[PDB]
Amino acid sequence: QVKLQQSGAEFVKAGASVKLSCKTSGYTFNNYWIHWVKQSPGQGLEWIGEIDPSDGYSNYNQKFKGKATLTVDKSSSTAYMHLNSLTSEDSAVYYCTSSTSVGGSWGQGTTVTVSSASTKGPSVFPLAPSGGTAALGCLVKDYFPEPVTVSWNSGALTSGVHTFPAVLQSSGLYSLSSVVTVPSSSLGTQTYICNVNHKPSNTKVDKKVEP
Amino acid sequence: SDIELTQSPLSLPVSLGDQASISCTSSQSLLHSNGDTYLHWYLQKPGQSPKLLIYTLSNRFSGVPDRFSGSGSGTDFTLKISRVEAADLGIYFCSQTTHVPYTFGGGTKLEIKRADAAPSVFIFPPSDEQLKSGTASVVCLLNNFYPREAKVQWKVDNALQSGNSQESVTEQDSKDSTYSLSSTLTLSKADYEKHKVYACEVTHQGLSSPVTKSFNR
């Protein structure tokens, strides 16, 4: 029954605004309050504010008063949150939540990424191998936005693969590694290729990795 | 200011089928004037939204397994999980909605315990392709280790490198319960070509003492 369907990811620049939405169903929209929550690496989980759709009354975490604005639209059973004058401190996942009495489920979250950076494909560099088990990989460098995907030998190779989370470099571009450990004695017998894909730029690269 | 909720422990290793106990302390009384105590417990799985397990102290949310139980009062609260299973792994948060502004604890990670495993360490020089293009990334891989805590230290001709490296860590392995970590050291092409000994030193509980992997260019 109860569902909170939030809007998709947002990539916007500093000073810009965004408006997030949370379409509800499976309960009487007008009879329960709606809350928004921020989740960020820097501050963890924070309650932003609450709104009563019945009369539009709202109540804020003083920290977000003015920055966040809560509104509803009854016709569509949708709640909104407007964020203004965005800084990189506003880069976070934002959740919308129902009253506990209707279940108190949360929407799936909407990710807001505040950046200047423009879309850009990665360069792919080999992490070549050099007793018993060897390691090798690909460095997938200087792309925006997330995600990139990496597989090994067209999905055929999965055992011992670790694809690390991306890090945001001070340049405002991302970088990550994907590694695999293979048996030492296969090197020069067995070919290894990382299959890299960055859909936002349409950058697809298959990179062979060797001694 | 805001009510602070302090969780303990920060990380709780357990074995499947074990009992787990997580606590949450409040800087103020969470007893409301209506008699209720608005202290709630959530589980967040990786890449998912927080899920409510227990609300207002001990009310078990409809469809949440009875293995989860919430107790305590005033300012001291405990979540108990009687026979931990795969589905229960993730970060547990307490929160309070007694006093505006509503606040959240910092979370307690529930993870799988295993025997110490020393990381397998590998260093990778920058590729000639990358150097062509004007940057040098040096990569140090720490592979399949437990516990999570590991210190990586980059040294360039014995100069301790500080603030020019970045680490990334994988989620705990679904099969073998280990972690892996990569650390990337970034230099200019010019600076990389000024030095010889690139060295990654790894300190880990699973090792007799710090291992070093180096290469000379």
Author numbering:
A (entry chain H): 1 to 52, 52A, 53 to 82, 82A, 82B, 82C, 83 to 99, 101 to 127, ...
B (entry chain L): 0 to 27, 27A, 27B, 27C, 27D, 27E, 28 to 211
What does the paper say about this structure?
Human osteocalcin (bone Gla protein, BGP) is a useful biomarker for bone formation and bone-related diseases. The anti-osteocalcin C-terminal peptide antibody KTM219 is a representative Fab fragment applicable to the Q-body immunoassay. Q-body is a fluoro-labeled antibody, single-chain variable region (scFv) or antigen-binding fragment (Fab), and its fluorescence intensity increases when its antigen is added. In this study, to reveal the recognition mechanism of the KTM219 antibody and to discuss the structural basis for Q-body, we solved the crystal structures of Fab of the anti-osteocalcin antibody KTM219 and its complex with the antigen osteocalcin C-terminal peptide (BGP-C7).
To elucidate the mechanism of Q-body, we tried to crystalize Cys-tagged KTM219 Fab (Cys-containing peptide tag (MSKQIEVNYCSNETG) was added to N-terminus of VH) chemically modified with TAMRA-C5-maleimide (Biotium, Hayward, CA, USA) using thiol target labeling. However, we did not obtain crystals suitable for structural analysis. Therefore, we grew the KTM219 Fab crystal in the presence of free TAMRA fluorophore. The crystal belongs to the orthorhombic space group P21221, with unit cell constants of a = 66.19 Å, b = 69.52 Å, and c = 96.65 Å and contains one Fab antibody fragment per asymmetric unit. Although the overall structure is almost the same with/without the addition of TAMRA, the CDR-H1 and CDR-H3 loops of VH near the binding pocket have different conformations. However, we did not find the electron density assigned to TAMRA. A detailed comparison of the structure with the addition of TAMRA and the structure complexed with the antigen shows that the CDR-H3 loop has different conformations, although the overall structure is almost identical. In addition, the CDR-H1 structure with the addition of TAMRA has a partial helix, which partly resembles a helical conformation of CDR-H1 in the antibody–antigen complex. These findings suggest that TAMRA does not tightly bind to the specific site on the antibody and that weak interactions with TAMRA may affect the structural conformations of the CDR loops of the antibody around the antigen-binding pocket. In addition, in the structural analysis of the KTM219 Fab crystal grown in the presence of TAMRA, the electron density assigned to TAMRA could not be found, suggesting weak and dynamic interactions between the antibody and TAMRA.
